[PDB]
Write a protein that holds these residues in place. Sequence first.
Motif, PDB file in Angstrom:
ATOM      1  N   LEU A  40       0.803  -1.231   0.000  1.00 19.93           N
ATOM      2  CA  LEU A  40       0.000   0.000   0.000  1.00 19.93           C
ATOM      3  C   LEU A  40       0.831   1.274   0.000  1.00 19.93           C
ATOM      4  CD1 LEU A  40      -2.925  -1.074   2.449  1.00 19.93           C
ATOM      5  CD2 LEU A  40      -2.803  -1.234  -0.079  1.00 19.93           C
ATOM      6  N   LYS A  41       2.103   1.178   0.383  1.00 23.61           N
ATOM      7  CA  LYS A  41       3.011   2.346   0.321  1.00 23.61           C
ATOM      8  C   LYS A  41       3.495   2.523  -1.092  1.00 23.61           C
ATOM      9  CE  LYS A  41       5.374   0.961   4.667  1.00 23.61           C
ATOM     10  NZ  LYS A  41       4.752   1.923   5.619  1.00 23.61           N
ATOM     11  N   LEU A  42       3.621   1.431  -1.852  1.00 23.34           N
ATOM     12  CA  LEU A  42       4.231   1.513  -3.156  1.00 23.34           C
ATOM     13  C   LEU A  42       3.312   1.459  -4.334  1.00 23.34           C
ATOM     14  CD1 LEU A  42       7.514  -0.537  -2.567  1.00 23.34           C
ATOM     15  CD2 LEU A  42       7.131   1.884  -2.006  1.00 23.34           C
ATOM     16  N   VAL A  43       1.985   1.294  -4.139  1.00 27.78           N
ATOM     17  CA  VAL A  43       1.068   1.165  -5.285  1.00 27.78           C
ATOM     18  C   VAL A  43       0.026   2.229  -5.164  1.00 27.78           C
ATOM     19  CG1 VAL A  43      -0.513  -0.333  -6.614  1.00 27.78           C
ATOM     20  CG2 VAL A  43       1.530  -1.325  -5.607  1.00 27.78           C
ATOM     21  N   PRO A  44       0.260   3.345  -5.885  1.00 25.25           N
ATOM     22  CA  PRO A  44      -0.694   4.449  -5.878  1.00 25.25           C
ATOM     23  C   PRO A  44      -2.111   4.014  -6.204  1.00 25.25           C
ATOM     24  CG  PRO A  44       1.355   5.224  -6.871  1.00 25.25           C
ATOM     25  CD  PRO A  44       1.556   3.746  -6.498  1.00 25.25           C
ATOM     26  N   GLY A  45      -3.041   4.530  -5.444  1.00 29.78           N
ATOM     27  CA  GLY A  45      -4.466   4.314  -5.676  1.00 29.78           C
ATOM     28  C   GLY A  45      -5.038   3.170  -4.845  1.00 29.78           C
ATOM     29  N   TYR A  46      -4.170   2.207  -4.480  1.00 34.87           N
ATOM     30  CA  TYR A  46      -4.700   0.884  -3.999  1.00 34.87           C
ATOM     31  C   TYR A  46      -5.423   0.999  -2.705  1.00 34.87           C
ATOM     32  CZ  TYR A  46      -5.402  -4.137  -4.377  1.00 34.87           C
ATOM     33  OH  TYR A  46      -6.008  -5.402  -4.561  1.00 34.87           O
ATOM     34  N   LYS A  47      -4.791   1.743  -1.791  1.00 38.64           N
ATOM     35  CA  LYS A  47      -5.355   1.933  -0.453  1.00 38.64           C
ATOM     36  C   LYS A  47      -6.734   2.564  -0.461  1.00 38.64           C
ATOM     37  CE  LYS A  47      -3.690   2.817   4.259  1.00 38.64           C
ATOM     38  NZ  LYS A  47      -4.890   3.389   4.911  1.00 38.64           N
ATOM     39  N   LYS A  48      -6.888   3.607  -1.276  1.00 40.25           N
ATOM     40  CA  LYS A  48      -8.163   4.313  -1.332  1.00 40.25           C
ATOM     41  C   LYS A  48      -9.256   3.602  -2.064  1.00 40.25           C
ATOM     42  CE  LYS A  48     -10.823   7.888  -0.617  1.00 40.25           C
ATOM     43  NZ  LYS A  48     -10.373   9.274  -0.764  1.00 40.25           N
ATOM     44  N   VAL A  49      -8.880   2.962  -3.154  1.00 37.59           N
ATOM     45  CA  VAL A  49      -9.827   2.330  -3.997  1.00 37.59           C
ATOM     46  C   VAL A  49     -10.306   0.973  -3.479  1.00 37.59           C
ATOM     47  CG1 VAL A  49     -10.026   1.290  -6.342  1.00 37.59           C
ATOM     48  CG2 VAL A  49      -8.974   3.586  -6.036  1.00 37.59           C
ATOM     49  N   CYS A  85      -8.932  -7.718  -7.894  1.00 36.34           N
ATOM     50  CA  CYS A  85      -8.056  -7.704  -9.071  1.00 36.34           C
ATOM     51  C   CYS A  85      -8.805  -7.096 -10.292  1.00 36.34           C
ATOM     52  CB  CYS A  85      -7.628  -9.121  -9.448  1.00 36.34           C
ATOM     53  SG  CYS A  85      -6.534  -9.284 -10.894  1.00 36.34           S
ATOM     54  N   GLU A  86     -10.062  -7.476 -10.472  1.00 36.30           N
ATOM     55  CA  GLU A  86     -10.864  -6.889 -11.614  1.00 36.30           C
ATOM     56  C   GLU A  86     -11.159  -5.399 -11.443  1.00 36.30           C
ATOM     57  OE1 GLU A  86     -14.167  -8.524 -13.605  1.00 36.30           O
ATOM     58  OE2 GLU A  86     -13.915 -10.487 -12.634  1.00 36.30           O
ATOM     59  N   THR A  87     -11.322  -4.951 -10.205  1.00 33.08           N
ATOM     60  CA  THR A  87     -11.529  -3.526  -9.894  1.00 33.08           C
ATOM     61  C   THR A  87     -10.316  -2.642 -10.276  1.00 33.08           C
ATOM     62  OG1 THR A  87     -13.145  -3.861  -8.120  1.00 33.08           O
ATOM     63  CG2 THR A  87     -11.932  -1.846  -7.981  1.00 33.08           C
ATOM     64  N   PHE A  88      -9.118  -3.141 -10.076  1.00 35.52           N
ATOM     65  CA  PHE A  88      -7.936  -2.370 -10.228  1.00 35.52           C
ATOM     66  C   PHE A  88      -7.155  -2.587 -11.514  1.00 35.52           C
ATOM     67  CE2 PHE A  88      -3.855  -0.489  -8.683  1.00 35.52           C
ATOM     68  CZ  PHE A  88      -4.338   0.625  -8.032  1.00 35.52           C
ATOM     69  N   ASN A  89      -7.459  -3.652 -12.253  1.00 33.02           N
ATOM     70  CA  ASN A  89      -6.608  -4.060 -13.353  1.00 33.02           C
ATOM     71  C   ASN A  89      -7.457  -4.200 -14.634  1.00 33.02           C
ATOM     72  OD1 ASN A  89      -3.686  -4.985 -12.271  1.00 33.02           O
ATOM     73  ND2 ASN A  89      -5.304  -5.643 -10.844  1.00 33.02           N
ATOM     74  N   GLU A  90      -6.908  -3.708 -15.734  1.00 31.66           N
ATOM     75  CA  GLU A  90      -7.556  -3.955 -17.031  1.00 31.66           C
ATOM     76  C   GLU A  90      -7.575  -5.485 -17.339  1.00 31.66           C
ATOM     77  OE1 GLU A  90      -9.470  -2.170 -19.080  1.00 31.66           O
ATOM     78  OE2 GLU A  90      -9.123  -0.174 -18.385  1.00 31.66           O
ATOM     79  N   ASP A  91      -8.713  -5.926 -17.898  1.00 28.21           N
ATOM     80  CA  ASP A  91      -8.810  -7.319 -18.462  1.00 28.21           C
ATOM     81  C   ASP A  91      -7.636  -7.698 -19.383  1.00 28.21           C
ATOM     82  OD1 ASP A  91     -11.162  -7.610 -16.992  1.00 28.21           O
ATOM     83  OD2 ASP A  91     -12.436  -7.249 -18.726  1.00 28.21           O
ATOM     84  N   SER A  93      -4.353  -7.133 -19.415  1.00 28.42           N
ATOM     85  CA  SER A  93      -3.051  -6.925 -18.761  1.00 28.42           C
ATOM     86  C   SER A  93      -2.646  -8.284 -18.306  1.00 28.42           C
ATOM     87  CB  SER A  93      -3.150  -5.935 -17.600  1.00 28.42           C
ATOM     88  OG  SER A  93      -4.120  -6.300 -16.602  1.00 28.42           O
ATOM     89  N   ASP A  94      -1.390  -8.478 -18.008  1.00 31.77           N
ATOM     90  CA  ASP A  94      -0.988  -9.758 -17.507  1.00 31.77           C
ATOM     91  C   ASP A  94      -1.717 -10.086 -16.166  1.00 31.77           C
ATOM     92  OD1 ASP A  94       1.412 -10.903 -19.341  1.00 31.77           O
ATOM     93  OD2 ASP A  94       1.804  -8.775 -18.989  1.00 31.77           O
ATOM     94  N   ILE A  95      -1.873  -9.083 -15.316  1.00 32.28           N
ATOM     95  CA  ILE A  95      -2.464  -9.345 -13.967  1.00 32.28           C
ATOM     96  C   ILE A  95      -3.952  -9.594 -14.121  1.00 32.28           C
ATOM     97  CG2 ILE A  95      -3.008  -8.265 -11.709  1.00 32.28           C
ATOM     98  CD1 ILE A  95      -0.250  -6.998 -11.864  1.00 32.28           C
ATOM     99  N   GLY A  96      -4.593  -8.830 -15.017  1.00 32.92           N
ATOM    100  CA  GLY A  96      -6.016  -8.916 -15.294  1.00 32.92           C
ATOM    101  C   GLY A  96      -6.369 -10.334 -15.794  1.00 32.92           C
ATOM    102  N   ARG A  97      -5.572 -10.835 -16.721  1.00 27.03           N
ATOM    103  CA  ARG A  97      -5.709 -12.192 -17.249  1.00 27.03           C
ATOM    104  C   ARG A  97      -5.429 -13.258 -16.185  1.00 27.03           C
ATOM    105  NH1 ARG A  97      -3.902  -9.793 -21.904  1.00 27.03           N
ATOM    106  NH2 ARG A  97      -1.633  -9.946 -21.450  1.00 27.03           N
ATOM    107  N   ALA A  98      -4.386 -13.051 -15.378  1.00 28.20           N
ATOM    108  CA  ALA A  98      -4.095 -13.930 -14.271  1.00 28.20           C
ATOM    109  C   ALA A  98      -5.294 -14.085 -13.376  1.00 28.20           C
ATOM    110  CB  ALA A  98      -2.887 -13.495 -13.467  1.00 28.20           C
ATOM    111  N   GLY A  99      -5.983 -12.992 -13.042  1.00 30.63           N
ATOM    112  CA  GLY A  99      -7.109 -13.070 -12.140  1.00 30.63           C
ATOM    113  C   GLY A  99      -8.293 -13.799 -12.702  1.00 30.63           C
ATOM    114  N   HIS A 100      -8.582 -13.562 -13.989  1.00 31.00           N
ATOM    115  CA  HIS A 100      -9.598 -14.406 -14.653  1.00 31.00           C
ATOM    116  C   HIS A 100      -9.274 -15.859 -14.654  1.00 31.00           C
ATOM    117  CE1 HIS A 100     -12.193 -11.200 -15.715  1.00 31.00           C
ATOM    118  NE2 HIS A 100     -11.194 -10.524 -16.236  1.00 31.00           N
ATOM    119  N   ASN A 101      -8.040 -16.250 -15.011  1.00 32.13           N
ATOM    120  CA  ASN A 101      -7.627 -17.639 -15.018  1.00 32.13           C
ATOM    121  C   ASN A 101      -7.753 -18.318 -13.622  1.00 32.13           C
ATOM    122  OD1 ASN A 101      -6.946 -17.245 -17.747  1.00 32.13           O
ATOM    123  ND2 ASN A 101      -4.740 -17.448 -17.410  1.00 32.13           N
TER     124      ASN A 101
END
Length: 115
Positions: A40-49, A85-91, A93-101
């Motif tokens: 949460l210190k290193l990923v802008p937006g995450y804490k609030k969102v 993961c779906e809230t914060f990441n585009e479908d 993206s590598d992370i977005g796809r990881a979360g769907h899988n």
Amino acid sequence: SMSVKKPKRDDSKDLALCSMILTEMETHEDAWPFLLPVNLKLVPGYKKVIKKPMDFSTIREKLSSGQYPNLETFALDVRLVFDNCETFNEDDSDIGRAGHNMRKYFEKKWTDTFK
């Protein structure tokens, strides 16, 4: 209702079975975005969102220390990981796809083990 109970579904192995599922999710090659809490210190937006952060290590600790009252509260935390993961990441993206899988992988194991 009072003195009127549905027949007892056997839940005595649920802890062991959720632990096996969690192991399988931990060792999946696409688990890497989900293994540890988002920093949460290193990923802008995450804490609030993301109002309720969740990750596999945090589920493992909760599982190991009796903090899930039943198998449904365990599934809620796993789904929270993928919903976050779906809230914060585009479908696309590598992370977005990881979360769907991973969500797909989880939901099959869940059905096969319990339904």
